Design an enzyme around this catalytic site. Sequence first.
Site, PDB file in Angstrom:
ATOM      1  N   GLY A  81      -2.732 -15.484  -5.467  1.00  0.00           N
ATOM      2  CA  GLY A  81      -1.863 -14.764  -4.856  1.00  0.00           C
ATOM      3  C   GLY A  81      -0.182 -14.675  -5.399  1.00  0.00           C
ATOM      4  O   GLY A  81       0.331 -13.883  -5.138  1.00  0.00           O
TER       5      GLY A  81
ATOM      6  N   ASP B  17       2.527   1.936  -3.357  1.00  0.00           N
ATOM      7  CA  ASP B  17       2.958   2.053  -4.784  1.00  0.00           C
ATOM      8  C   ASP B  17       1.816   3.309  -5.384  1.00  0.00           C
ATOM      9  O   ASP B  17       2.196   3.899  -6.318  1.00  0.00           O
ATOM     10  CB  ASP B  17       2.575   0.865  -5.864  1.00  0.00           C
TER      11      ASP B  17
ATOM     12  N   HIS C  83       0.777  -1.280   0.002  1.00  0.00           N
ATOM     13  CA  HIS C  83      -0.161   0.111  -0.140  1.00  0.00           C
ATOM     14  C   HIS C  83       0.775   1.376   0.047  1.00  0.00           C
ATOM     15  O   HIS C  83       0.464   2.280   0.869  1.00  0.00           O
ATOM     16  CB  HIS C  83      -0.935  -0.198   1.252  1.00  0.00           C
TER      17      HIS C  83
ATOM     18  N   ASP D 284       3.882  -6.124 -11.454  1.00  0.00           N
ATOM     19  CA  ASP D 284       3.617  -7.614 -11.532  1.00  0.00           C
ATOM     20  C   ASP D 284       4.805  -7.989 -12.881  1.00  0.00           C
ATOM     21  O   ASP D 284       5.370  -9.026 -12.864  1.00  0.00           O
ATOM     22  CB  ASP D 284       2.348  -8.092 -11.848  1.00  0.00           C
TER      23      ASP D 284
ATOM     24  N   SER E 104      -1.688 -14.113 -13.615  1.00  0.00           N
ATOM     25  CA  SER E 104      -2.185 -13.106 -14.814  1.00  0.00           C
ATOM     26  C   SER E 104      -0.902 -12.738 -15.623  1.00  0.00           C
ATOM     27  O   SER E 104      -0.839 -12.584 -16.872  1.00  0.00           O
ATOM     28  CB  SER E 104      -3.301 -12.302 -14.254  1.00  0.00           C
TER      29      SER E 104
END
Lengths: 499, 497
Positions: free
Chosen positions: B141, B38, B36, B191, B145
């Site tokens: 988690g 970014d 929390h 990611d 994706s």
Amino acid sequence: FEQKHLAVVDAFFQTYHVKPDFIARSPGRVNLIGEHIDYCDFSVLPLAIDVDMLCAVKILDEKNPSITLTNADPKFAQRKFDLPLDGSYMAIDPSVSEWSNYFKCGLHVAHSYLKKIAPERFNNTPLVGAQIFCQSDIPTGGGLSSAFTCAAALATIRANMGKNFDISKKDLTRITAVAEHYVGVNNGGMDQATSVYGEEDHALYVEFRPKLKATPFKFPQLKNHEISFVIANTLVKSNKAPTNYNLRVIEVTVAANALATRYSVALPSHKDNSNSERGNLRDFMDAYYARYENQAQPWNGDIGTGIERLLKMLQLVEESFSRKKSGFTVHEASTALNCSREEFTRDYLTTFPVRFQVLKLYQRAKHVYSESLRVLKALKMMTSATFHTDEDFFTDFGRLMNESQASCDKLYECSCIETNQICSIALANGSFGSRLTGAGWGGCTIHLVPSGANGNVEQVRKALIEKFYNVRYPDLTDEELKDAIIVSKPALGTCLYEQ
Amino acid sequence: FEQKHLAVVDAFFQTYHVKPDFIARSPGRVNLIGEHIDYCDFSVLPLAIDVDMLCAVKILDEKNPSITLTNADPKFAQRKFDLPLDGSYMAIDPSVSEWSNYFKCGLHVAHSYLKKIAPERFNNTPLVGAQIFCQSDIPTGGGLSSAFTCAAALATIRANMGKNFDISKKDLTRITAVAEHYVGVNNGGMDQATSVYGEEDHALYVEFRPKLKATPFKFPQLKNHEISFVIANTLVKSAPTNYNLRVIEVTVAANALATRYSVALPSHKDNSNSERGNLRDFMDAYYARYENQAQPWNGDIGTGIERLLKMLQLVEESFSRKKSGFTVHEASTALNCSREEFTRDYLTTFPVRFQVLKLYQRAKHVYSESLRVLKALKMMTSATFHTDEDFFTDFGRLMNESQASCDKLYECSCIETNQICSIALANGSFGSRLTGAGWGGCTIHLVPSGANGNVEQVRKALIEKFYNVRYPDLTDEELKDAIIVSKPALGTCLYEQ
């Protein structure tokens, strides 16, 4: 109607063994025209409906003030709490689905108002204690949260200031609209303004610029019909996506900026109220007129000017976007905004999750301007239009509702199969006009249906029960089925009944 | 584990009756420190992990090019689609959620990249067909994706450009980060960057300012222990009281700070994870005004530690007497504006539920957590560890300090998270914290591995004291997917067959 008012007094007496001092009442609400335009600052057309929250109250004289809340509905357990002796606001925590939360919101906003008008009385002293009996027949979609908040705020004001104190509709609306941040809802105060300003036989023109404001407009007098609305829930929970609301907010904001770029105007900062942080499609309409129509003043809600400028907006939308109905990729949208992909991504794709291949600027802008226009056309029909038969009124007004549904569905893509099924069934069985209402992607629908002896109310309701509810939801109880379909005329707003 | 490649190639042959040409691989990922922060433009510390998506591919020469996708999991039914003969992009419908979506994302972004380098080659002509077998062991988690998208993009580049051409990690990261808006995820490219830039024995310093960038940082070589991480899912799926409220709280906090110190929040001229001025912008505004460092912080670690420590002092000076939180009225006052303007500017489009905005706690979290990222990197590169326990302890303490911040200052933990971490620390873990979106999701634990490691001690503790209790009816497959063990892994790569 009046039957309900006695039932709540009598149940209060069963519960607390004393006659209540007064009842505070506030009605539910539903939007008749104007969906998904409020966050572009355009005005909507709701009405108060004849389901309500009723709060019977006995004022107490206690050393340590306490409030007891009992609900007519057995599933909502009795609540009791002590008011802080220091005069501080009650603690509310919205990480619960607690039925009394809405009462506490109302109590809170009333408390801060009372501190404003009478500091020496309310800054360091608790409010008065009370015994309260709450009874509501507002179903899902009918705006229970604002009705309860408003009845609770008025009850608190009445209990503490006495029967000879009056709060204006304007003040009661202002202080209760703040409660949106306790509830987790974002309709810009429209729910509270409707519950407060409702009048029998009237819809409300609810505006947001320069201020949240409501103006009652009376339905035409009909020769031998009555105007009623059937409200039928899809039973798809609207509240339940990155492809939906978040995506729409991005699309209409990008559209406003694409238009601003194409016509070389700047979107002026908001100096007054707004339902958006940044420049929106109404701001573009004003900026365009200011530059291209000889210093035209910003639209301030009159029907004639609105119609003219919204028609112009739809023309600019055809001119700007009609060759790109397949939508804009991020690249094409950046080009339309005269910025880089990095600038675009930074400005529009950063905070909230979204999912799309293209942004449908043509469709979303066309919806907002055309739907805003239908609100004004509805007002025009209600007031200045002539109808040689009652039927002509139902047909023409109903046609606006149908055109609204078609736009919400085909252009804004915020309908769903259940909505379309209900609308189609209603229209084949006595409705003149049928559309979704509320948040979209589920939720409620509303239907223009003549009531009375020559009306279609039972015909519509029977067909919906047999062709929709019995088919899709066979296991609904009688109570659930009763809540799913209600019938209403426009209703009176928040008020007190002395006892 | 390298029997993976054998068992993927074999499975490919059992499906298509021919040997694959190459295997494209991309790892899952996990965040180690930096939750929390970014969206306030602060940098995070993830790593690529030992679970991956593998795409075995046979390149097809066809008149009418088609792509067949088969999965190792039988419950994911075979997909087959023809490639648009007008060189058009496939249809990635946003509403339908199915397993092949991430593949089409990668295919799409690779196709777009190819059109730009060789328009005459790819513009109005379809890509080559393929037979593809997809095998993933990434759990919830773990970032399937991004892994699948990156593996698919690379598989697409490879099939169409040949064995010698290699896309830069820089360009691969750029083009896959775009896919976030096709998936419905908003991690600012972290990611994809992690999946592409992972290296064995390294975490990544992933920055967003002034650009998305990843820099590998090696873990310290230890004498007789190995560094591993246990990743345990709470099995609670990751609200107006949650994410939305946090975004409002940190945005209002940055403006209350800017107002208090009479500075304006500098505009964004490069990359950013927020639309409006944020807590990093305030840091730059304060420094330009009071510390004559007109230059925005560039991500340098030593400088960053200094400036973040400064920000924490200002949070104490500005908010420590208002830990009760700010009402809307109080927030308007702290911003020197009316309630109407506050409401319009901060409360309009997205739903929220709060009685107060907790500016002290949220700002304290974002700055202290951002500081912990830098301290982690500093700790990793310094040679001050005389014993292995010195490292596991000190690094573990940063993780624990992060978990306490998330829990008490940001309130984005949950009881399952707290239970899992408490158990882990009392049973072999040196440091335990939530990772990911919060309010559920996964947890990560620093645990020595190998012969004299605590991996099995922790795993047994969690199974017997958490899962068996809270989730008694977990199957052995579910119970297995819930806990994995990993070391830092290599990023996206190709294996020619």
